Amino acid sequence: MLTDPIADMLTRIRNATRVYKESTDVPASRFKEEILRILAREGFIKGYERVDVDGKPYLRVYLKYGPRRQGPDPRPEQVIHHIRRISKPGRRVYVGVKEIPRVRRGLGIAILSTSKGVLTDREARKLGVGGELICEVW
Amino acid sequence: DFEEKMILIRRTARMQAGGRRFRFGALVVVGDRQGRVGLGFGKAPEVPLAVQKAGYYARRNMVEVPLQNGTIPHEIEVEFGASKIVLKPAAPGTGVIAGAVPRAILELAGVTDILTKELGSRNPINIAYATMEALRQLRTKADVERLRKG
Amino acid sequence: GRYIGPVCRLCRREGVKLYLKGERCYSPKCAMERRPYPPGQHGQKRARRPSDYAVRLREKQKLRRIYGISERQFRNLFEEASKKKGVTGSVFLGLLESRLDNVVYRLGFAVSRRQARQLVRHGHITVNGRRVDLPSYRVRPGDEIAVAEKSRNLELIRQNLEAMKGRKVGPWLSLDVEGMKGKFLRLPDREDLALPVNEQLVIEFYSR
Amino acid sequence: VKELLEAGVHFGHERKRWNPKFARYIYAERNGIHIIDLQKTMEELERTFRFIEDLAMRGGTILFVGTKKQAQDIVRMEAERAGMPYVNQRWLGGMLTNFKTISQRVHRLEELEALFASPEIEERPKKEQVRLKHELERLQKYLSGFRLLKRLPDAIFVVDPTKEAIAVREARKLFIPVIALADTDSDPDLVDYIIPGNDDAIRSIQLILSRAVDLIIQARGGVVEPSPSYALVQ
RNA sequence: CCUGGUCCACCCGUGACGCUGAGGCGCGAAAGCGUGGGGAGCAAACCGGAUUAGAUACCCGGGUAGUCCACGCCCUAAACGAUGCGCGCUAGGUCUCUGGGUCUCCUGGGGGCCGAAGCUAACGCGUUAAGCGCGCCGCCUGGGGAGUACGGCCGCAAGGC
RNA sequence: UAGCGCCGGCCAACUCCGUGCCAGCAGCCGCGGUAAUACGGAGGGCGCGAGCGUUACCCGGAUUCACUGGGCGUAAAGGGCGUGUAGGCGGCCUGGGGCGUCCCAUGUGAAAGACCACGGCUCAACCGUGGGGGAGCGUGGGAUACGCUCAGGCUAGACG
Ligand SMILES: [Mg+2]
Ligand SMILES: [Mg+2]
Ligand SMILES: [Mg+2]
Ligand SMILES: [Mg+2]
Ligand SMILES: [Mg+2]
Ligand SMILES: [Mg+2]
Ligand SMILES: [Mg+2]
Ligand SMILES: [Mg+2]
Ligand SMILES: [Mg+2]
Ligand SMILES: [Mg+2]
Ligand SMILES: [Mg+2]
Ligand SMILES: [Mg+2]
Ligand SMILES: [Mg+2]
Ligand SMILES: [Mg+2]
Ligand SMILES: [Mg+2]
Ligand SMILES: [Mg+2]
Ligand SMILES: [Mg+2]
Ligand SMILES: [Mg+2]
Ligand SMILES: [Mg+2]
Ligand SMILES: [Mg+2]
Ligand SMILES: [Mg+2]
Ligand SMILES: [Mg+2]
Ligand SMILES: [Mg+2]
Ligand SMILES: [Mg+2]
Ligand SMILES: [Mg+2]
Ligand SMILES: [Mg+2]
Ligand SMILES: [Mg+2]
Ligand SMILES: [Mg+2]
Ligand SMILES: [Mg+2]
Ligand SMILES: [Mg+2]
Ligand SMILES: [Mg+2]
Ligand SMILES: [Mg+2]
Ligand SMILES: [Mg+2]
Ligand SMILES: [Mg+2]
Ligand SMILES: [Mg+2]
Ligand SMILES: [Mg+2]
Ligand SMILES: [Mg+2]
Ligand SMILES: [Mg+2]
Ligand SMILES: [Mg+2]
Ligand SMILES: [Mg+2]
Ligand SMILES: [Mg+2]
Ligand SMILES: [Mg+2]
Ligand SMILES: [Mg+2]
Ligand SMILES: [Mg+2]
Ligand SMILES: [Mg+2]
Ligand SMILES: [Mg+2]
Ligand SMILES: [Mg+2]
Ligand SMILES: [Mg+2]
Ligand SMILES: [Mg+2]
Ligand SMILES: [Mg+2]
Ligand SMILES: [Mg+2]
Ligand SMILES: [Mg+2]
Ligand SMILES: [Mg+2]
Ligand SMILES: [Mg+2]
Ligand SMILES: [Zn+2]
């Protein structure tokens, strides 16, 4: 039943950036919308809007690929290279500011739902809070 | 010129009716210790033939690894089928802490301090191909902010 | 302990004239200039292809047998150096060159590290007033390695400092031939040092 | 003056045999045929032709590849008129990556043209004459136009990328910017500069390639009237 | 005749009622067993004929149990798509079974093939995934010993777990 | 006073002689059958050095019980299949609570050790002082996204 909607949505993002789709139409929620707001703040994606089919509100994420590379297999390298729901339903992980992970030396980030809203790991270590470490995106 | 260090030399045998014809395989890397490696895998019926052919493919096929302070920008856990290699960059002054296969690939990229672990299968061919895939997957802060600045 | 004795044998076997005998290794009879090939019945044969372990062990021996350190003393120095906060090789080399026998060698009270070992072990050298009979005595930055009164008029120290009248001690050191002392200023580095030792291979030897 | 003629026969091809990554340009589906849109076609024509007008007068050479029955002689005619090398007949395996080896075949073509105008008709007897003639024709057939400029190319004009998957993979391997005319049976990922449009109508080949060759002749200077397919057609 | 499942369409109602599920309970080919019945063919065992050195086998003639019915047990299998279930996404082409449609199409469900990316040790799978995920369950941790022994449970027993 | 191991590969260091599938070596691979760099001796070398070796035991290598960090077509591994109890997991908007979570000052987290400075024994081992973590767990306040539950609603799941 989209047993994790966030781990459905991030793999919709991944399964579409692998086939180089222009846009995803993920389902809608406030938590998924704040997660995608964090991703568009960081610069992985080109935002989202509010679409509908037969009475179903959505988010249409516009992906952001790279330049057409040279050599064989000239597909653009993707800014969402890896994306992984860490705190799954079957194992909810939570960390403090002492255990916030620098996601591969500060190239990628960690979306984490904190008590002071949904924050990137920079914002978590800056405001002091930890929380449920939702997904590492790098 | 480059430093031209070979990793494994193996003598693979096909069966002819009669003897069994051999074919010396040879996996050299070429590296200037500046940030450029090449993995050549020549298969020749003679051994200096194999080293020359492998050096030819290795200089023909290079990859620029974007180093920082003599070590690596980010942690990278890459895989080549069943052979998977992690590379955790080090604080400098640590040494190329790696296996005998990718120690030469990193040391001829001209890193100084890198912490790896040859996981999975440790086969010297597949680990070198995975390590070339790692150092071709290696990105730094400038060339990821270039892809985020839009 | 001192390993013993034959040391131009180790001037050989690593291909670099790491000076151990002293004025012999400077004079034209080093038997490393005369015979650069390693000791042994084979010796001057084809070089066996140095393995990945072999190059690290040979250059760790180049770091050790310069200073004559027994291996567990060397390894305990290393496992103090790794805990010691700094660039690990470039604090390890300063720790190695901060032994009292090596500071006495760099200060030139002796032509060799083993002669400097006899100097400090037989109670000649004083550190900060009183004599210190330890070759493993570390020298803190900013102390005066001197010669005491019973060895100030020694013919050996006299000839050694006669040789060192005008010689160039390091920038992390000083010298005083009129009082035969020297302030160990700071710790040195590989850019300060004339080592034939890539330190990084010695660092890579110990994560075996 | 462009799409007025491009709307002639030069658009609309293969039914239900389509590489769906080409669906950027694919407009509709009538009588089964995937008709191709002409607006994005002509703007992509300018995207190619800007690069051709740059790297055609920058000393850069184009390598005209075409193997089908539909596009043989209308590649051979319009390819030789700017100095640009071609492959009219079967384009071999690795003319580009193995170029330093097929240079030996070009030199055997030269040292056999020495033997054409030679006193080795009188000596070098008839049984070697038939051997070297069967060598010369079987080398001058499949290595005719690949002789003109003695270096690796600077771009290639593939006339069909799915028939020339051997060619586009070689030029992508060698960083040679492929330009290629492709109908709905191809992908544009490994094509650096696409001419979307038909590939088997004789006018569809020759008129696009004639406008391309007029651009390369004007890029060299001194424009002359193009090559005719309107001589023996219909 | 009785009856299950499933699919389409309408978007009519309920308002998260969902998914998976250790132990349970039920079904579970074929063989096998019990109590009757039925027995035409086929046919273990068995008897013969050649066959062959030998033939307990192939081949041929016969031939019982069984195969069959009803009730009741057994509960294993190459019970295999050797692929646990559900849900979501990720190019397509094909003919093919069904469903709808102001239908040279297009949408839904099912059975295959060829293939994108990706996967994979490769074979290959590839919107019916062996891809990407998430939930839950069972299971594996070198082969042999050994699915045997011991114990327990089940079975009429063989035998199963 | 200098010894002990090792020299086929793994593992740094190789020749000769004696042996002849014997005597023997061995941690695995394996050597040994008359040219043995694998056995026995000599030379030489390497490693470590008042130690060096062996054994047993434990951890690492072992990502070989995989939480970080494995799989299940064929490699070991899908239960024969369904229904389903416990369980585990849970669509979307709203609101309180603040149970998980997180934060803040404390309370404890004894000393010794571990860690960092700085000192005393000729240095070091040791030893002294100072400082800091220190998982936890209680207490009081705060945070409310997410997990929770009670209330309200929705129709994209499911059923009719
Ligand atoms: Mg987890
Ligand atoms: Mg070949
Ligand atoms: Mg893998
Ligand atoms: Mg393994
Ligand atoms: Mg192994
Ligand atoms: Mg002497
Ligand atoms: Mg270590
Ligand atoms: Mg019915
Ligand atoms: Mg309704
Ligand atoms: Mg409700
Ligand atoms: Mg039966
Ligand atoms: Mg019975
Ligand atoms: Mg019966
Ligand atoms: Mg019968
Ligand atoms: Mg019989
Ligand atoms: Mg018989
Ligand atoms: Mg019969
Ligand atoms: Mg009976
Ligand atoms: Mg049964
Ligand atoms: Mg059975
Ligand atoms: Mg089956
Ligand atoms: Mg079956
Ligand atoms: Mg199951
Ligand atoms: Mg279908
Ligand atoms: Mg592959
Ligand atoms: Mg298939
Ligand atoms: Mg689809
Ligand atoms: Mg076992
Ligand atoms: Mg039993
Ligand atoms: Mg009983
Ligand atoms: Mg069972
Ligand atoms: Mg060796
Ligand atoms: Mg004997
Ligand atoms: Mg022995
Ligand atoms: Mg003999
Ligand atoms: Mg012998
Ligand atoms: Mg021996
Ligand atoms: Mg173990
Ligand atoms: Mg472990
Ligand atoms: Mg795990
Ligand atoms: Mg198997
Ligand atoms: Mg199996
Ligand atoms: Mg099974
Ligand atoms: Mg079973
Ligand atoms: Mg099954
Ligand atoms: Mg169920
Ligand atoms: Mg429940
Ligand atoms: Mg709480
Ligand atoms: Mg406290
Ligand atoms: Mg304490
Ligand atoms: Mg003191
Ligand atoms: Mg103390
Ligand atoms: Mg203290
Ligand atoms: Mg805690
Ligand atoms: Zn010397």
Pairing of β D155-158 and β D62-65: parallel
Spatial separation of the C-alpha atoms in residues A68 and A74, rounded to whole Å: 6
Spatial separation of the C-alpha atoms in residues B39 and B59, rounded to whole Å: 8
C8 is in an annotated binding site: yes
Spatial separation of the C-alpha atoms in residues C153 and C14, rounded to whole Å: 38
3-state secondary structure labels for all residues of B57-71: HHHHCEEECCCECCE
Closest CA to D183 of D68, D61, D64, D54: D68
Please, which positions of strand F sit below 7 A from a protein CB? 2, 10-15, 43-50, 52, 62-63, 69, 88-94, 100-104, 115-117, 122-124, 134, 142-147, 155-157
Half-sphere exposure of residue D220: CA atoms within 13 angstroms, side-chain side:
16
What's the B84 CA to ligand 33 centre distance in angstroms? 53
The full length of chain A comes to: 138
Spatial separation of the C-alpha atoms in residues B86 and C148, rounded to whole Å: 57
Spatial separation of the C-alpha atoms in residues D69 and A48, rounded to whole Å: 50
Pairing of β C143-147 and β C125-127: antiparallel
Q: Cβ–Cβ contacts within 10 Å for residue C93, how many?
A: 24
CB B5 within 8 A of CB B31: yes
**CATH 3.40.50.10490 boundaries in chain D:** 4-91+148-234
B95 and C52 within 8 Å at the Cβ level: the answer is no
Conformational region of residue B93, where left means phi above 0, alpha means psi within -120 to 50, and beta covers everything else: left
Closest CA to D182 of D199, D169, D167, D170: D199
> Is B24 in a helix, a strand, or coil?
strand
Question: Which CA distances in Å does C39 have to A105, C8, C29, C121, C137?
Answer: 49, 10, 16, 30, 33
CB D56 within 8 A of CB D77: no
- DSSP lists the bridge partners of residue B79 as B84
B102, B116: one domain:
yes
B31, B76: one domain:
no
Rg, C-alpha atoms of chain C: 18
B75, B135: one domain:
yes
B105, B122: one domain:
yes
Tokens describing residue B2: 């480059």
CATH at residue B57: 3.30.160.20
Q: Which residues contact C166 (CB under 8 A, 6 or more apart)?
A: none
Q: Which CATH architecture has domain A3-80?
A: 2-Layer Sandwich (3.30)
Measured torsion, CA atoms of residues C57, C60, C61, C63, in degrees rounded to the nearest 10: 170
Q: What does DSSP assign to residue D66?
A: -
Q: CA B108 from chain center: how many Å?
A: 9
Closest CA to B109 of B56, B73, B80: B73
B86, B38: one domain:
no
The label of the residue with tokens 């193995």 reads D98
CB C197 within 8 A of CB C16: no
CB D63 within 8 A of CB D150: no
Half-sphere exposure of residue D223: CA atoms within 13 angstroms, side-chain side:
11
Q: Cβ–Cβ contacts within 10 Å for residue B15, how many?
A: 8
Run of H or E including B48: helix B47-60
Is the CB of D32 within 7 Å of strand E? yes
Run of H or E including C102: helix C100-106
The label of the residue with tokens 């079957």 reads A90
Is the CB of B77 within 7 Å of strand F? yes
Spatial separation of the C-alpha atoms in residues D199 and D183, rounded to whole Å: 6
Residue extents of the structural domains in chain A? 3-80, 81-138
Task: Give the count of Cβ contacts less than 8 A between chain A and D.
Answer: 14
CA triplet D223, D228, D233: central angle to 5 degrees?
165
Of A66, A77, A104, the CB nearest to B74: A104
Spatial separation of the C-alpha atoms in residues A135 and C116, rounded to whole Å: 62
Closest CA to A24 of A43, A3, A46: A46
Closest CA to A84 of A71, A72, A101: A101
**CATH classification number, D92-147, choose in 3.40.190.10, 3.50.50.60, 3.90.1150.10, 1.10.287.610:** 1.10.287.610
Spatial separation of the C-alpha atoms in residues C119 and C105, rounded to whole Å: 10
Task: Classify domain D4-91+148-234 by CATH number.
Answer: 3.40.50.10490
Q: What does this entry list as its resolution, in Å?
A: 3.7
Closest CA to D95 of D201, D167, D8: D167
B97 and C207 within 8 Å at the Cβ level: the answer is yes
Spatial separation of the C-alpha atoms in residues B101 and B79, rounded to whole Å: 15
Q: Which one-letter amino acid corresponds to residue D222? A: G
Spatial separation of the C-alpha atoms in residues D144 and B115, rounded to whole Å: 56
Spatial separation of the C-alpha atoms in residues B119 and C46, rounded to whole Å: 36
Half-sphere exposure of residue B141: CA atoms within 13 angstroms, side-chain side:
9
B80, B25: one domain:
no
CATH at residue B84: 3.30.230.10
Spatial separation of the C-alpha atoms in residues C188 and C91, rounded to whole Å: 8
Spatial separation of the C-alpha atoms in residues C106 and C169, rounded to whole Å: 7
> Is B106 in a helix, a strand, or coil?
helix
Nearest CA in chain A to B148: A43
Spatial separation of the C-alpha atoms in residues B69 and B65, rounded to whole Å: 13
Q: CA D62 from chain center: how many Å?
A: 8
Of B73, B140, B150, the CB nearest to A43: B150
DSSP string, D75-110: HHHHHGGGT--EE-S---S-SSTTHHHHHHHHHHHH
**Ramachandran angles phi, psi of C86, nearest 5°:** 165, 175
Question: Which CA distances in Å does D19 have to D39, D188, D191, D194?
Answer: 20, 9, 13, 14
Spatial separation of the C-alpha atoms in residues B119 and B121, rounded to whole Å: 6
Spatial separation of the C-alpha atoms in residues B58 and B54, rounded to whole Å: 6
Q: Cβ–Cβ contacts within 10 Å for residue A105, how many?
A: 17
State the smallest CA–CA distance between residue A103 and chain B in angstroms. Answer: 9
Closest CA to D25 of D13, D208, D212, A66: D13
Best mutation target among A22, A65, A69, A70 (most D Cβ atoms within 10 Å) is A70
Q: Which CATH architecture has domain A81-138?
A: 2-Layer Sandwich (3.30)
Q: CA C63 from chain center: how many Å?
A: 9
Question: Which CA distances in Å does C127 have to A136, C104, C161?
Answer: 58, 10, 18
Closest CA to C108 of C15, C198, C170, C185: C170
The total number of structural domains in chain B stands at 2
What's the A94 CA to ligand 54 centre distance in angstroms? 9
Tell me which method was used to determine the 3D structure. Answer: cryo-EM
Tokens describing residue A101: 């992970």
Spatial separation of the C-alpha atoms in residues C21 and C24, rounded to whole Å: 6
B21, B69: one domain:
no
The label of the residue with tokens 């470039």 reads C90
Nearest CA in chain B to C86: B93
Q: Kindly list the structural domains of chain C, giving each domain's residue range(s) and its CATH number in brackets, ordered by start.
A: 1-96+194-208 (1.10.1050.10), 97-193 (3.10.290.10)
Chains B and A are in contact, defined as 3 or more C-beta pairs closer than 8 angstroms: yes
The full length of chain C comes to: 208
**Which residues 46 to 85 of A reach strand E, CB within 7 A?**
73, 84-85
B56, B70: one domain:
no
Closest CA to B143 of B67, B82, B60, B31: B67
Q: What domain range is B85 assigned to?
A: 64-148
Q: Which chains touch D (3 or more CB pairs under 8 A)?
A: A
A79 and B147 within 8 Å at the Cβ level: the answer is yes
Interface of A with D in 49-108 (CB under 8 A): 70-75
Spatial separation of the C-alpha atoms in residues D181 and D168, rounded to whole Å: 12
Q: Which one-letter amino acid corresponds to residue D118? A: S
**Ramachandran angles phi, psi of B83, nearest 5°:** -85, 120
